[PDB]
């Protein structure tokens, strides 16, 4: 059976991971103690996708948690699902990174990387057919950026044929959380732009907007944003675990979504997202979900899609569905949004449907978009990296860890090429 191993690094990495297995276990009806309590046999038919069965009426999720300080992982152990993971997979250091990409990649993480790969190798050996890898981290973060890229390069070298997904939180344009985000992002993009097959960019700014208006949540917290992120991440692999009329696995999405090897950055989405008051006054039907998922306000990325165009779109539906309705709405989106799709790609929509919906919903859909509008995101980082690096604003911390100033300029140029390549394909043949 197609199988995956999940990797989570850094504070954002682990916390989203924790709010991810809290949801995968719910879909498969897995008790926090690890015992199965699902009400349907169709959940165990593909449990092995994320879990390695341990004899005794319990299942263990093959996940690897990496963090240079133990603070974030200690909280996970104390969580409702902390005891679910195998204790051996909890690998951590002692000196946490100071939000510097250098320390999490060259000096501190270099010593612990060997330990991480050994667990990863055992998990891979425990599988019968490994399909790909999943990494959760944050580009602005030091551990995730630095240690995540180091792990991606090693596993890619070790397993070149296998796929690897990345759900990376991207710095927001207006309000940040770390001063030196521009350095961490550019260094990390320099590695993800050649090592990973598909990446999903997420920003908390966009998620904050969703909670404020789309969901009318007065006091949201990361306990809530991670739930939205976990929904999309679970949706991407609905096909590997449950049956449907038109199944689309990780590789199928990659081929339909990645036209050129370097243009593998997507913006996820989800629907329906309605408050409790609005539940009465809305009909949960295919025609309404299609509008919500293509709405710029429902996007989990700060960049407005309307400022660009879509190379490829992939729609993953869930629940009881009508194929003709799904075909109709996608056709309407193709015709209605005439200038929102490139001319050199006559078909821009990849549709997928699954029989089982998520949680208590009777219908769900997940939106993946490889839109050209993401150029405005790297461009902003491109301006924030240049302004700081122009006079060595914070370089003396990265230099002291071994990084040479030459590596910095190469990543900036490799970042400018990515934006130029995005602008290049935004053109039209006529």
């Amino acid at each position: 059976m197609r199988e995956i191993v999940h990797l989570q690094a850094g504070q954002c990495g682990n916390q989203i991971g924790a709010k991810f297995w809290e949801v995968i276990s719910d879909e498969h009806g897995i008790d926090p103690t690890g015992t199965y309590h699902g009400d349907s046999d169709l959940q165990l038919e593909r449990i092995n996708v994320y879990y390695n069965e341990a004899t005794g009426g319990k299942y263990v999720p093959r996940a690897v948690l990496v963090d240079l300080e133990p603070g974030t992982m200690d909280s996970v152990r104390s969580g409702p699902f902390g005891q679910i993971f195998r204790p051996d997979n909890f690998v951590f250091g002692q000196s946490g990174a100071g939000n510097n990409w250098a320390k999490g990649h060259y000096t501190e993480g270099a010593e612990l990387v060997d330990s991480v790969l050994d667990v990863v190798r055992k998990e891979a050996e425990s599988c019968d057919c490994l399909q790909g890898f999943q990494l959760t981290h944050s580009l602005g973060g030091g551990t995730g950026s630095g240690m995540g890229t180091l792990l991606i390069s090693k596993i890619r070298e070790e397993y070149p044929d296998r796929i690897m997904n990345t759900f990376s939180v991207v710095p927001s344009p207006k309000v940040s959380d770390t001063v030196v985000e521009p350095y961490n992002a550019t260094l990390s993009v320099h590695q993800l732009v050649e090592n990973t097959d598909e990446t999903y960019c997420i920003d908390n700014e966009a998620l904050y907007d969703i909670c404020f208006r789309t969901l009318k949540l007065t006091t949201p917290t990361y306990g809530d944003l991670n739930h939205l992120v976990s929904a999309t991440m679970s949706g991407v692999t609905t096909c590997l675990r449950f049956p449907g009329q038109l199944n689309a696995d990780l590789r199928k999405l990659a081929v339909n979504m990645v036209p050129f090897p370097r243009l593998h950055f997507f913006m996820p989405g989800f629907a329906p997202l309605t408050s409790r008051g609005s539940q009465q006054y809305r009909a949960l039907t295919v025609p309404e979900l299609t509008q919500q998922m293509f709405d710029a306000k429902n996007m989990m990325a700060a960049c407005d899609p309307r400022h660009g165009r879509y190379l490829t779109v992939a729609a993953v539906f869930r629940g009881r569905m009508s194929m003709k309705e799904v075909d109709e709405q996608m056709l309407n989106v193709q015709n209605k949004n005439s200038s929102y799709f490139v001319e050199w790609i006559p078909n821009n929509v990849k549709t997928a449907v699954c029989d089982i919906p998520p949680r208590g919903l009777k219908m769900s859909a997940t939106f993946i978009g490889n839109s050209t509008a993401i150029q405005e995101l790297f461009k902003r980082i491109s301006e924030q990296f240049t302004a700081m690096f122009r006079r060595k604003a914070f370089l003396h911390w990265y230099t002291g860890e071994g990084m040479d100033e030459m590596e910095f300029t190469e990543a900036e140029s490799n970042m400018n090429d990515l934006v130029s390549e995005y602008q290049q394909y935004q053109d039209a043949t006529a």
């Binding site: 199944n247 199928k252 081929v255 050129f260 394909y425």
Partner: protein
């Protein structure tokens, strides 16, 4: 008639197969557990175990366990032979190269072994039935492998295949133009006549003719199953003007490179609406030649009919068929190519269509299926080729195919082969 072999490859073919065998079991009164409990010629599609059991003569193949897993867990689980449900490990991921070069090669040998054993028990083999999607990873790459293997190993036998031709407007995948042409080039030579059907066209039928506002792929396969049943009705029942399996290619293939007929079926009416229509032979006969009723979105009026096969089924009278066909030929709006004065191949069988419980199709004692090799499909080929060259001009998705063991030269060769096919239709579409 003697045995005919069925092959189901890909999600579309596999899902169609379970619908096709639902009709076959119902038609012959075979229970879903493989035991006859309500026409002794059912041996065409079934092999008797010798202990009061029947094993369908099909080979379900796929590169992923998901679709076949449903069959193994479905009601027809005990029906199929366990070894016939051949499955791989990783799906072709909508890539033609994977299903033909990398992952398809690993499982092709096992498929042939079962196919060889099926032939060993044949006192007579008319041909093969291959169900696949014209556009798709496993349904386009792996089918080409079987066509090459079956042609060389067996040869001198009919090879009918049903393909989900990509709809012009509706499309559920991005790289279909690459995938459809690659299989067409490799399957054009080894095929005899491939029946074509669109998802959009059947949806339109389900919406206009039928009163179903919530169709699904399950409904389409059920409406496609009767297409296959009618084509093989002669091999399984008795009636005047029997049409053997090999007769289809002789009548419907004027030239070796033009063997892509389209499919039409009639009557298609809901249970309530049937009470208001007589459904006489002329009515259904005229309906088959209606743009609104054909299962391919290409406009029949935009070209000319070259050959037509009318497989009348039910309590039909041969005199009515002859008079009805005469009425069609005298129509001026319809036009047949000059070099084929005779184009109609009639087939009558005394077995009305079976009623599928829970279906959207009403009970009719008089049904007809039309196969028409029409030049109007040339427009569809050009549109599909137009999509291919537009993408290929920029190498939109070529790198995926290149890394899967397929050289870039095949794209140029395949398109040129398609271009020649367009010219072939143009050459046969005019007369002095």
């Amino acid at each position: 008639m003697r045995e005919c072999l069925s092959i189901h490859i890909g999600q579309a073919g596999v899902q169609m197969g379970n619908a096709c065998w639902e009709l076959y079991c119902l038609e012959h009164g075979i229970q879903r557990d493989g035991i006859v409990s309500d026409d002794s010629s059912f041996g065409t599609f079934f092999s008797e175990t010798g202990s009061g059991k029947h094993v369908p003569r099909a080979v379900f193949v796929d590169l992923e366990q998901t679709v076949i897993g449903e069959v193994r867990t479905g009601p027809y689980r005990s029906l199929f032979h366990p070894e016939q449900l051949i499955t791989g490990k990783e799906d072709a991921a909508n890539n033609y190269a994977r299903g033909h070069y990398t992952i398809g090669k690993e499982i092709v040998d096992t498929v042939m072994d079962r196919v060889r054993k099926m032939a060993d028990q044949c006192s007579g083999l008319q041909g093969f039935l291959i169900f696949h999607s014209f556009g798709g990873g496993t349904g386009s790459g792996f089918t080409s492998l079987l066509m090459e293997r079956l042609s060389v190993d067996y040869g001198k036998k009919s090879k009918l295949e049903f393909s989900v031709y990509p709809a012009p407007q509706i499309s559920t995948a991005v790289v279909e133009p690459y995938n459809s042409i690659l299989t067409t080039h490799t399957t054009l030579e080894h095929s005899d006549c491939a029946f074509m059907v669109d998802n959009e066209a059947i949806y339109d039928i389900c919406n206009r003719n039928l009163d179903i506002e919530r169709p699904t792929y399950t409904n389409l396969n059920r409406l496609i199953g009767q297409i296959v049943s009618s084509i093989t009705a002669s091999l399984r029942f008795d009636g005047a003007l029997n049409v053997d399996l090999t007769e289809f290619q002789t009548n419907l293939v004027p030239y070796p490179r033009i063997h892509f007929p389209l499919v039409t079926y009639s009557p298609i009416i809901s249970a309530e609406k049937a009470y208001h229509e007589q459904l006489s032979v002329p009515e259904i006969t005229n309906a088959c030649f209606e743009y609104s009723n054909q299962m391919v979105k290409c406009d029949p009026r935009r070209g000319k009919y070259m050959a037509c096969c009318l497989l009348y089924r039910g309590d039909v009278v041969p005199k009515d068929v002859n008079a009805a066909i005469a009425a069609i030929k005298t129509r001026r709006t319809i036009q047949f190519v000059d070099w084929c004065p005779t184009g109609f191949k009639v087939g009558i069988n005394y077995q009305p269509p079976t009623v599928v419980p829970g279906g959207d199709l009403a009970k009719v004692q008089r049904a007809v299926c039309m196969l028409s090799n029409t030049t109007a499909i040339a427009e569809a080929w050009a549109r599909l080729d137009h999509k291919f060259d537009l993408m290929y001009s920029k190498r939109a998705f070529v790198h995926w195919y290149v890394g899967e063991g397929m050289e870039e030269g095949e794209f140029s060769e395949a398109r040129e082969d398609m271009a020649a096919l367009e010219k072939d239709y143009e050459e046969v579409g005019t007369e002095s």
